[PDB]
C-alpha cells in the first residue's frame, strides 16, 4: 500500500498529518506511520519536519519511541516508528482515573529516564504532555513526538515559544528567552500532577483563562496526595526557573527514593551521565538482501528499506 506497509487504520492525528497503524509486509510487525501532506506545508514547516527527523535519529533509549524508516515522495512524507500497543497515558487516565502513587512513581521514573537521556544528548522535548507519553505492550513508557524538539548548549537561551498550553512553563506564555531543560522540568511537574490526580493543575475554558492560571503558579493539592509527592511537585512547578529542581535533584527526591530499592533506575540515570546481530543478518541474506549493503545502510543512518528491516527483525 505505501512501500512495504499495508495500512490498517487511523490511530491518531498531528500537525498537518494523520497517524495510521500499519503492518510491515516482510516482517509482519506493527508500526505507527505519520503521513504528512507537503502541499499544506511552508518553508518553515518543512525545516521543522527535517529537524524532528534528525533529532529522532540521535535518540536510542528503552523509553523513547524508535524511528525505523523515513520515506519521501514528491507530494508526501511518511515517518515509520515502533508501535506503542498500549497507546497514550492520557487515554489510560480517561479510562481508569488517577494513578496510585506506587504505579505513578514507576511511570514517572521511566519518563524522567528518557527526558534525562535527551538533555544528556543536548536535546529538549518542549512538548511533554499526557497524550505524548505512550505505553508499550507491557505498559511501559515510550516518549514520542519530537516536533517541537530542539538541540541546545548548556547555558544558552532559546527563543521558540512552543509547547502544549496546559504543560507549558510560564516564561513560554510571557515570551521570555528561556533555559531548555527548565522548561521540560515544569512540564514534568504538570505530568506528575496529572498522573497522581487524574486532572490538570492549571485548566480553563479557553487559552486566555489557562494562561492566567499558569502565570499565577497557584494550584490545588488534593487530600490523597502524600506530603512527599506534594513537596516534589511544589519544587518543580516554581515560577522562577532557577528555583526549580534539576533533573539530578528530581531523581534523588525523597518521593522518588520511596518504596522498594530500585537499582535498575539508578543504573539508567548513571548511563545518561556520560553489538551486531549476525543471526538477523543471516535471515536478511535469505530474503535476498546483501550483508554488506545492510551494514552500509546502518553505518550511514539512511533509515531506508535495509535499516527498517534490521531494526524490525531485532524484536
Amino acid at each position, epitope marked *: 500500500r505505501i512501500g512495504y506497509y499495508e495500512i490498517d487504520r487511523t490511530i491518531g492525528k498531528g500537525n498537518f498529518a494523520v497517524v495510521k497503524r500499519a503492518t510491515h509486509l516482510v516482517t509482519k510487525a506493527k508500526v505507527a506511520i505519520k503521513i504528512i501532506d507537503k502541499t499544506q506545508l511552508d518553508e518553515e514547516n518543512l525545516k521543522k519536519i527535517f529537524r524532528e527527523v534528525q533529532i529522532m535519529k540521535m535518540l536510542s533509549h528503552p523509553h523513547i519511541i524508535r524511528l525505523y524508516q523515513v520515506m519521501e515522495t514528491e507530494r508526501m512524507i511518511y515517518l515509520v516508528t515502533e508501535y506503542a500497543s498500549g497507546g497514550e497515558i*492520557f*487515554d489510560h*487516565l*480517561v*479510562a*481508569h*482515573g*488517577r494513578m496510585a502513587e506506587k504505579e505513578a512513581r514507576r511511570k514517572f521514573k521511566q519518563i524522567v529516564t528518557a527526558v534525562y537521556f535527551c538533555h544528556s544528548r543536548n536535546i529538549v522535548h518542549r512538548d511533554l504532555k*499526557a497524550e505524548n507519553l505512550l505505553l508499550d505492550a507491557n505498559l511501559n513508557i515510550k516518549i514520542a513526538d519530537f516536533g517541537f524538539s530542539n538541540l541546545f548548549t548548556p547555558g544558552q537561551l532559546l527563543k521558540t515559544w512552543c509547547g502544549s*498550553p*496546559p504543560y507549558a512553563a510560564p516564561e513560554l506564555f510571557e515570551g521570555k528567552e528561556y533555559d531548555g531543560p527548565k522548561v521540560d522540568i515544569w512540564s514534568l511537574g504538570v505530568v506528575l500532577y*496529572v498522573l497522581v*490526580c*487524574g*486532572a*490538570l493543575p*492549571f*485548566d*480553563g*475554558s*479557553t*487559552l486566555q*483563562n*489557562l494562561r492566567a*492560571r499558569v502565570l499565577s503558579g497557584k494550584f*490545588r493539592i*488534593p*487530600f*490523597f496526595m502524600s506530603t512527599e509527592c506534594e513537596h516534589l511537585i511544589r519544587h518543580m512547578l516554581v515560577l522562577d526557573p532557577n528555583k526549580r529542581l534539576s533533573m539530578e535533584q528530581i531523581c534523588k527526591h525523597k518521593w522518588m527514593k520511596l518504596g522498594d530499592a530500585d537499582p535498575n533506575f539508578d543504573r539508567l540515570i548513571a548511563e545518561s551521565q556520560q553489538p551486531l546481530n549476525e543471526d538477523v543478518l543471516l535471515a536478511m541474506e535469505d530474503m535476498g538482501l546483501d550483508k554488506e549493503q545492510t551494514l552500509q545502510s546502518l553505518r550511514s543512518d539512511a533509515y531506508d528499506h535495509y535499516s527498517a528491516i534490521y531494526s524490525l527483525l531485532c524484536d
Partner: single-chain antibody
Amino acid sequence: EVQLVQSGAGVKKPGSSVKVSCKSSGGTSGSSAVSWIRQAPGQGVEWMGGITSIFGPANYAQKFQDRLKITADKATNTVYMELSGLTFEDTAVYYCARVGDYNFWNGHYRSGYYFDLWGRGTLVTVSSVLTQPPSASGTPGQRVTISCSGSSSNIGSNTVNWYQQLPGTAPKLLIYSNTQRPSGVPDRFSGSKSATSASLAISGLQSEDEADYYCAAWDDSLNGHVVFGGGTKVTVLG
C-alpha cells in the same frame, strides 16, 4: 432517540464508595462531554465534575476533587462516576448530562456549558453561588420574572442557561446562550443578560409552568466549574 441510561438506585453504608454508570444509547454515537450533577432530596442541583475543556482528562469541582473519580469507556460509550468516603450528606439523585456544544470546542471557542441531554437520575442513599429568589408566584396570564445575580467571573464573563425541573424529573434546558430557546420551548419563555445578572421571563403564565427553575453559568474561578442558582419554585396562583 439519543438517551443517557443510568445504573439503578442503591443503599451504601457510610465510609463505602459508590459507582454510577451512564451509557449513551441511540442516534449520533461517538464523542461527548458528559458531566455529573447531583441533587439532594428537596435541594438544588450541584455540578460535581466532568469533561469541560479540550486540555485535560477530566475536571472536578473543588468540593468533590478529593473523593470523585470520573472515568469513561469509549468502547462501550459508558461514562462512570465513583464517589468514595460516603456520608449521610451524599444521599442524593446523581445525574449525568451532556454539554451541548462539545463539537465546537477548540481552545479558543468559549463553551456555553448548557446541558443538552440528561439521564433519568440514580438515587444513591447512605444509611446504616448564583443568587436566585427561593420562590416566585403569579395568577394565570401574568408575566412572572426570576432574577439571577452573579459575579464578574461567572455571569459577567460567560453565557447564562436556564433549566426547568418538573416533579420527579431531571432538569430540562429551557434557555441557552442568554436568550436562545431549544426546540419545544414556547415563545412565552425569554431570557436576558445584563452585566453580572440574568433574568427569566414567563409571559402568559399557565398552570403547567408550576416547576423549579434553575439558572446556570460557567465560572472562570479556579480551574473552572459550572455554577448553579438556588432554584425558584414558581407557583401558579388561582
